[PDB]
Write a protein that binds this ligand. Structure first.
Ligand SMILES: [Zn+2]
Lengths: 25, 97, 144, 48, 223, 100, 100, 48, 148, 148, 50, 48
C-alpha cells in the first residue's frame, strides 16, 4: 500500500566510503 | 530468478514506538523515532524484490483527493516480512502536484 | 597549532578502543554524522546512533543494531566522541580544493595541508607543495 | 610490413559500477529510430 | 585464444573464477604437439643427434639421406664411423641440403647394407616469420599458427560448453506469482552445447589441413 | 615472386592480381568474422526465450540451434560462393605436372 | 622398455613421451568419468519433470532420453577427438610387419 | 608404484537424521551467487 | 623520440558562435544525455532547414552520411555540450583531459593536486601529462583523479 | 611406527588479533552458518578494501583464487568462528577434536568421561586419542561422544 | 582431469562426499593400460627378460 | 499439505485482528473433524 496520508522521509542509511566506479590497477 | 527480475529496495522493519501513551493507547504527535505515526522503524536493509500490478488509485472526496492503491510484491527466500513493514524505492520517482 | 582534531590512523587502535567500550564519531560524505558503539552484556555487537549531542538530563542518545562495515571505518575519518571539537572557525576546511599563486607569479591549485593561527586569532594556511604560509585573502576557494 | 599480432590486453579493472539513471530535463531530444517491417490490417479485405 | 573468443568469458558458474593462463599454455602445448604429428613435422627448433643405416642404392646416389624430422634449418656434422671412431669426416663445402624436404646430399669436389654406419647432427624446426604474408621454406607459415589455434579452441569449447546452463539441462521455465522466465539452450540429448561450434571448427580444419599437406607433399621410401 | 596490384579497372595482366583473389581472401576473412559474430547476438547458447512480467510479454526465437550455430547460414553460403570462385580460378592457373 | 617424461616444452625425442599420449590417456579417463557423472545430475532415469505448488511452478528438461544418456554428447565428442588423435599417432609408430 | 585399488568402504551407518533449520541471526552474510545468462526485453523494439 | 601535442576538442559554450558556424554550414556534433551522440547540419540550397544524422563518423569515400530533416531546439543546444565535427574524434579519448585537476604523487611522498596544462603522446601512443609547477611529464598509471 | 601429532585449527576469538592479521593481509576463513564457508582478505595496494572469495581451497599453481569486493561486517566476524586459512584444511576432520569430552570404556567395565588432550595419527591414517589419567591411546571405535 | 572438467563438480547426491583421488588414480591406471593396448607399445619404463 | 496460507488483517475499533484462510490436504484413511487443531513447529511467524 502506498504512503500518502502520512509521509516519512527516506531512511538514514549508513554510507560506505568505497568510491563507485573505482579504477583498480 | 528473484535477484534477476527484482528491483533494489530498502527493507526496514516496523515496531511500535515506546512513545505511545500508556493510558489512551495512542501516540505522541512528534518524536524522533516516529513522526506522529504510532509505529517506528528499524535501520534499513538493502534488498532485491519483485513488484507487480502497481496502482495509483485516486479517490476524490469532500475531504480532498487521496492517493491509495494496491501493489503486489514477491520477496527472496528466508525473509520473514511482518505487518506494516515499510519499503522505499529510490530509483523510481513519482510526479505529484 | 589547534587541538580541534585528533584523527585515528590504524583500524587496530579503533578496534582496541571499541573493546574498551569508548564511543566513536564517524564522519560521512554529504550526510549526517554517526556515532558508533559496542553493545554491553553477554552478546557483543555493534550499535549506532544518529544523535550527536552530549548526554544530559534533557537529552539521551538512542542506540540500535547495525551491520557496520569495516570499509567505512578504514576509509572514513574517526575520532573519540568525548574529545571531538564541533568546529574550528576558519574560512576553509582541511582537505579542501584551493587556488593560489606561486613565488614566480604563476597560478596553481592545491589542497590545504595545515590550518594554523597566531595568538591574536589571525589564521595562516599551508598548502601542499608550499612550505610558506598563506593569508586567508591570498587563498581562493575553488568551486566544485 | 611487420606481421600483425594480437599482443596484450588493455582493459583495466573496474569495481563497484553504479547504474545509469536517465536524467530528467525539459530540453528537446531526438528519438533514435529503427527501420524495419510494419504490420497492417488488410482493410479492403475487412470491407469484404 | 581469447581474441578468437571475443565476447565470450570462460567462467565457473558457481563461483566467479575464470580459468587461468596456465591451462591455456597446457592446451596450446598439446595443440602444437597434435599438429606436429598430424603433418609429420618438427615445428619448434630443436637439435637432433641422428644415426642412419647404409643403403647402397641411395649411397651411390650422391649419398642421399632423408632426415626423420623436417624441416632442416641447418646441418652441423655429417660423419661416417665404423665402431665409434670417425673413419671419414667430409668437408663442409661438399655437403648440401634441401631445407623443406630435408634431403641431405653430398657433392664431392677436388652385403648390400649395413646398420648405423653414418652419423648426422642437425637442427629441426621453423623460425618465426619475419615479414607479413610471406615466409621462406625454412620459416613458419601463417597457417600453422591458425591451425594450432583452432586445435586449442576445440579443447576450450569442449570445456566451456558444459558451463552454459546448469549441468546437462536443455529446457527450463520458472513461473512464480505470474512472473515467467523460460530458456531453451543448444544443449540436447543428442548434441552438445558447443557442438555447433565444434562442427564448424572441423569444417574449418578440414579445409586448412588438406590444403597444407599439399605444401609438404606425400612421403616415399624405396624398397 | 608475387603479384602487382591491379592498375586499370576490371582488367589484369598475367603478372597482375585478378580482383577475385582480393575477394576470395575477403570471403575467407568473413568466415572467421561470422564464426565470431554468430555467438554474440543473444547471451550464449540460447536458442529460444520468452519472458512475461506484469502484463507485458516477449518471445524470441534465434537462429541458434543444437544442430547449427547462429551464423551457420552465412558461413554455408560463403562456402557455396568460395567453391565456385575457387574452382573457376584454378582454371586460370591449371594443374601441376612433373616428369619422372 | 617404455618412455621417459618429456624434458623440454613442446618437444620430444624418439625415446621421449609425446604430450598426446598423456592427453589420450586423459581422454580415455574422462570417458569413464562422464559415464559416471552423467547419471547423477537429477535423480536417476528422469528425463522430464514439472512441479506446481501454491502458485509457483517449475519445469526442467534434461539431456537424458530413452535413446541417449545425459552425458552422451560429451562422450561422443571425446570419441571424435580420440579417433583423430589415435589415427594420427599411429602414423608416428607405423604398421607392424613380420616375415614368413 | 603399487597398483591403485578401490579397497573397502568407510562410510558409517547413521540413524534418525534430523532436518537442518536455518538459524535466525541479526548478523550479516553474503549471498552465494550463480553466474549465468540473463533475460531482458528489447526496449528499442518496444519503442518501435 | 615522440609525437607533438594533441589538441583537445574544445566545447563551444556561446550560442552565438554556434549559430554562426551553423549558418556557415559547418557540421556540429551534439552530445545528447538521453539518446547518445548526433550530428547537426544546415540544409544546403535555398530551402533552408536543419538536418540531423546519426551516421556518427568522419565522412569518407566509402561511408557517406545520410541527413534527415529535424526541428532542432535552441534549449537542446544550450543545455548540451556541442563540438565541431572536424575536431571531435576517437584519436584521443584521454582519461585525464586538459584543465582537469588530478592527484599526483610527488617525490617527497606527499600527494598533491595539479591541473593538467599540456598533454602529448609518443611512439607507443602513451599519454604524457604536464602539471603546473613541474617540468617532468608524468604517466597514466602514476596519476589519479578526484571527483566531487 | 607412526606419524607425529597433528595440530587442530585453533579458532580465533579475540577480534583484535583478527583485525591485526587482516591488516597484515593474512587470509581468513569464515564459517557462515547460513551459506557455507568463505574466505576473507584485505585488498593489496593503496586502495584498501575487504574482499571475499568462495574459491575454497588452498592456493595452487593450477588453481588461483578470485577475489570480489565485499563489505564484511564486524558482527559477522564476532558471531562466526574464524580460522587462519594456512591451518584449516581437509587433512584431519577428526570426529573427536582436541579438548572434547568423550566417553570411553575402561578395563573395569565402567564408562568414564575424559577430555582429549592429544591426538595423533599412524601409517594407516588412524586417529589415536590420548585421554587424561591414562597412558594407552584409544581408537576411534572404542570411544563415544555425549552431547548436551 | 579436474582441470579438463573445470566448472563441473561430481558428488554423491545422498551425501556431501565427492569422489576421492583413489578412484581417479584407479581410472587413470586402467586408461593408460587401455592406450597401451590401443597402440602396441610399452608406455612406462619397465625391465624385460626376453 | 498446505496451500493459499493468508494472514488476513482486519483493523477495527476493538483493535487489529489476525484471521485468514489456509487450505490443506491430508493423507488417506484419516477422518478429520470440525475444529480439530494443527501446529507446525518448523514454521515461525513474526508478531509485534
Ligand atoms: Zn514515537
Amino acid at each position: 500500500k502506498r504512503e500518502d496520508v502520512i509521509v516519512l522521509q527516506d531512511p538514514y542509511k549508513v554510507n560506505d566510503g568505497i568510491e563507485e566506479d573505482l579504477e583498480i590497477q | 530468478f528473484i535477484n534477476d527480475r527484482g528491483i533494489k529496495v530498502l527493507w526496514e522493519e516496523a515496531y511500535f514506538c515506546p512513545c505511545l501513551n500508556p493510558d489512551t493507547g495512542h501516540p505522541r504527535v512528534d518524536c524522533p523515532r516516529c513522526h506522529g505515526k504510532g509505529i517506528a522503524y528499524l535501520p534499513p536493509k538493502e534488498t532485491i524484490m519483485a513488484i507487480q500490478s502497481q496502482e495509483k488509485g485516486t479517490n476524490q472526496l469532500d475531504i480532498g483527493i487521496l492517493d491509495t492503491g494496491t501493489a503486489i510484491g514477491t520477496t527472496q527466500l528466508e525473509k520473514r516480512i511482518s505487518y506494516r513493514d515499510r519499503f522505499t524505492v529510490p530509483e523510481v520517482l513519482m510526479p505529484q502536484q | 597549532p589547534i587541538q580541534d582534531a585528533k584523527p585515528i590512523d590504524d583500524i587496530v587502535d579503533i578496534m582496541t578502543y571499541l573493546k574498551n567500550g569508548k564511543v566513536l564519531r564517524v564522519k560521512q560524505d554529504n550526510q549526517g554524522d554517526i556515532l558508533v558503539r559496542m553493545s554491553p552484556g553477554k552478546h557483543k555487537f555493534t550499535e549506532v546512533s544518529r544523535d550527536l549531542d552530549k548526554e544530559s538530563f534533557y537529552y539521551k542518545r538512542h542506540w540500535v543494531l547495525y551491520n557496520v562495515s569495516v570499509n567505512s571505518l578504514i576509509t572514513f575519518d574517526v575520532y573519540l566522541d568525548e574529545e571531538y571539537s564541533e568546529t574550528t572557525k576558519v574560512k576553509y576546511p582541511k582537505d579542501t580544493i584551493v587556488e593560489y599563486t606561486r613565488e614566480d607569479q604563476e597560478k596553481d591549485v592545491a589542497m590545504i595541508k595545515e590550518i594554523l593561527t597566531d595568538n591574536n586569532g589571525n589564521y595562516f594556511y599551508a598548502l601542499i607543495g608550499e612550505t610558506m604560509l598563506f593569508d586567508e585573502n591570498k587563498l581562493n576557494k575553488v568551486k566544485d | 610490413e611487420k606481421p600483425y599480432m594480437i599482443g596484450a590486453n588493455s582493459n583495466p579493472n573496474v569495481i563497484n559500477k553504479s547504474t545509469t539513471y536517465t536524467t530528467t530535463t525539459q530540453a528537446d531530444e531526438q528519438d533514435k529510430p529503427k527501420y524495419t517491417t510494419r504490420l497492417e490490417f488488410d482493410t479492403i479485405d475487412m470491407i469484404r | 585464444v581469447k581474441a578468437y573468443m571475443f565476447g565470450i568469458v570462460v567462467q565457473n558458474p558457481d563461483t566467479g573464477q575464470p580459468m587461468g593462463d596456465e591451462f591455456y599454455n597446457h592446451i596450446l602445448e598439446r595443440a602444437v604437439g597434435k599438429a606436429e604429428r598430424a603433418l609429420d613435422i618438427s615445428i619448434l627448433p630443436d637439435t637432433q643427434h641422428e644415426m642412419r643405416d647404409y643403403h647402397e642404392t641411395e649411397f651411390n646416389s650422391y649419398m642421399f639421406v632423408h632426415a626423420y624430422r623436417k624441416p632442416i634449418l641447418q646441418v652441423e656434422n655429417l660423419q661416417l664411423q665404423f665402431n665409434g671412431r670417425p673413419i671419414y669426416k667430409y668437408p663442409a663445402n661438399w655437403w648440401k641440403v634441401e631445407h623443406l624436404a630435408g634431403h641431405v646430399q653430398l657433392f664431392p669436389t677436388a652385403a648390400t647394407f649395413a646398420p648405423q654406419m653414418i652419423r648426422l647432427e642437425y637442427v629441426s624446426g621453423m623460425l618465426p616469420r619475419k615479414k607479413a604474408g610471406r615466409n621462406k621454406p625454412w620459416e613458419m607459415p601463417p597457417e600453422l599458427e591458425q591451425l594450432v589455434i583452432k586445435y586449442a579452441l576445440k579443447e576450450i569449447y569442449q570445456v566451456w560448453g558444459n558451463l552454459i546452463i546448469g549441468a546437462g539441462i536443455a529446457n527450463k521455465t520458472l513461473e512464480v506469482d505470474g512472473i515467467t522466465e523460460t530458456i531453451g539452450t543448444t544443449q540436447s540429448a543428442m548434441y552438445g552445447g558447443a557442438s555447433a561450434q565444434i562442427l564448424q571448427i572441423n569444417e574449418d580444419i578440414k579445409e586448412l589441413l588438406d590444403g597444407l599437406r599439399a605444401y609438404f607433399g606425400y612421403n616415399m621410401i624405396g624398397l
